[PDB]
Symmetry: D2
Subunit: 142 residues, 4 copies
């Protein structure tokens, strides 16, 4: 993938970017390293709930994809697969418009689990939400 | 629309435009202590790898738990928003449906807590979410 | 062990009950099955914080030991080891005195992780706290 | 005693009797945005298997995050208590010490959030705890 700028670790993918939830809501990966990665999204109605605010699930999802793909970037080539195992997001301040910018910092890279701390900020740079992401790492069945 | 609680005359975002309406979440039952919702698995719900996005489960539970709280407190001059969402993934979903069930466990003055269960078409437990909802007096 | 009524899965243990944190604070396992287990403790100062209430960590620990030992009861004999991997405890109502009674219900038993929902109640039966416990299961290095 | 914040003239439980004093927790630094504490590993801190009890890490973070909040809000007529404690375990501790560092990430009117890091004598990250503290007006 390179539409959302997801790590290109494979020749083909089951689902194309524009068709996934990520593509649908417009998540885009910016920087991506083994210990740190970034992504953002422009707020539109698609990202909000009926009350006009960025949906709680929006932050969870951004954090989810980011931490997970960040792990994938390293282990895919190592014959492993990585999937979110636990996602704990806490909401500090709501976002009504602009963007949401996420920064994932790796804190632990075990053999079966990697852990990332994700920060989600608004356009003013305020900390609106955080997510503790736990990623299971395993060998691809395929 | 998604059958969310009708508590106000106007909503800033129409269902079909919201994240919920975009992925297709629908509320089935709704009582003060328990609520259910579901969605058909489509690609809008998946990640590039073909599985239901972890964030989808998160979003389902979030809306369900929050909306079930709103259903009660709105009429009381209060607002409800998610404050914490902890989702744990036990088994992946490739296709079909995702069904959630929210069971209220605590209803405090400032916080409501709900245990949400997300099952696949076989009835298997695919994920869980502990939803913590902040309850506060509505702002003018 | 049988002092705190922990599962006797081994001939010997590195640390004796009365000397562990559990023995020290007085945790006692009541019922114990593959899908469900119970334990309680009598509140004393040892369980409280300076302000007179049951220490937040007290609930976390009870839940921790219970879920973990409950898993141990099944897999030890299977050559695995089990350790807490994640413990998420939420506090609803404080306890000043009496007991804390915990009930762990198994919700997921995977090959690498088991998950238990723990309820912690007071003497009136009120729900004072809950803990989501995630237990890693692995083969004993030894 | 454990060097907890001296904010009141009387405390219902003396340090040495509390859970904290029993296992040996001690506050080292304390500022509004950051605090540290530590404990010597002894058997009172371990489980039957010889490792530091998961609950010990939980307890350390709990007290640290809560007490660092109290340090500020008490004098303001408020009370602080843990509302959520999520501890994740990365590497076990058999002996030595456990050192915690709490970094304040959010300070709201009703909720303060702290990221706590628990390291072993080698400085390795053994566990983390996300502490959510409820802040409320003190009761008469
Ligand atoms: C995280 C996880 C791998 C942990 O493994 P576990 O707790 O020990 O559970 P199990 O290993 O017993 O297997 C549970 C299911 O996980 C999936 N799974 C496990 N290992 C897998 C692997 N190496 N490759 C693909 N799928 C795998 C399987 O569908 C499996 O069921 P089955 O093999 O009996 O058909 C597993 O719980 C899981 O896949 N949860 C789903 C994660 C998810 O859906 N996040 C959102 C999508 S990325
Ligand atoms: C965090 C908390 C204050 C949130 O309040 P809430 O969810 O809105 O719930 P409520 O305000 O309805 O009150 C629930 C109970 O919390 C306690 N509580 C709430 N606000 C309080 C305050 N300002 N002062 C003292 N106790 C308070 C009371 O015991 C109350 O029961 P009561 O109203 O019958 O006296 C509450 O859930 C709580 O106290 N949980 C226990 C915290 C704990 O034990 N942490 C470990 C020890 S610090
Ligand atoms: C949960 C856990 C096993 C997951 O494994 P992981 O994330 O993939 O990390 P790793 O497997 O790379 O190994 C991390 C450390 O775990 C311990 N560990 C892992 N597998 C183990 C096993 N089968 N037996 C004993 N210890 C083991 C080791 O001390 C290891 O370090 P080392 O082998 O390099 O000396 C691991 O993170 C852990 O043990 N955390 C500590 C759990 C804890 O202390 N809870 C409280 C005490 S019960
Ligand atoms: C949960 C929450 C209300 C707790 O309040 P808190 O921790 O004590 O923080 P504060 O009261 O100091 O306020 C922080 C921000 O929350 C919002 N907020 C707090 N109370 C509010 C209320 N009664 N009505 C509307 N917004 C409120 C405001 O945007 C506020 O910023 P402001 O005071 O400059 O206007 C707050 O952290 C929050 O709103 N988090 C975002 C919730 C969210 O986005 N969930 C997903 C969408 S529902």
């Amino acid at each position: 993938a390179t539409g959302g700028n997801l790590p290109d670790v494979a020749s083909h993918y089951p689902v194309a970017y524009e068709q996934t939830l990520d593509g649908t809501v417009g998540f885009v990966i910016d920087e991506m390293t083994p210990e740190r990665a970034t992504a953002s999204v422009e707020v539109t109605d698609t990202l909000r709930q009926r009350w006009g605010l960025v949906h709680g699930g929006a932050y969870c999802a951004l954090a989810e994809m980011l931490a997970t793909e960040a792990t994938v970037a390293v282990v895919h080539e190592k014959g492993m697969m990585a999937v979110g195992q636990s996602n704990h997001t806490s909401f500090f301040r709501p976002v009504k418009e602009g963007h949401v910018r996420a920064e994932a910092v790796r804190i632990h890279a075990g053999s079966t689990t990697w852990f990332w701390d994700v920060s989600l900020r608004d356009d003013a740079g305020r900390l609106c939400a955080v997510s503790s992401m736990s990623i299971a790492v395993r060998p691809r069945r395929d």
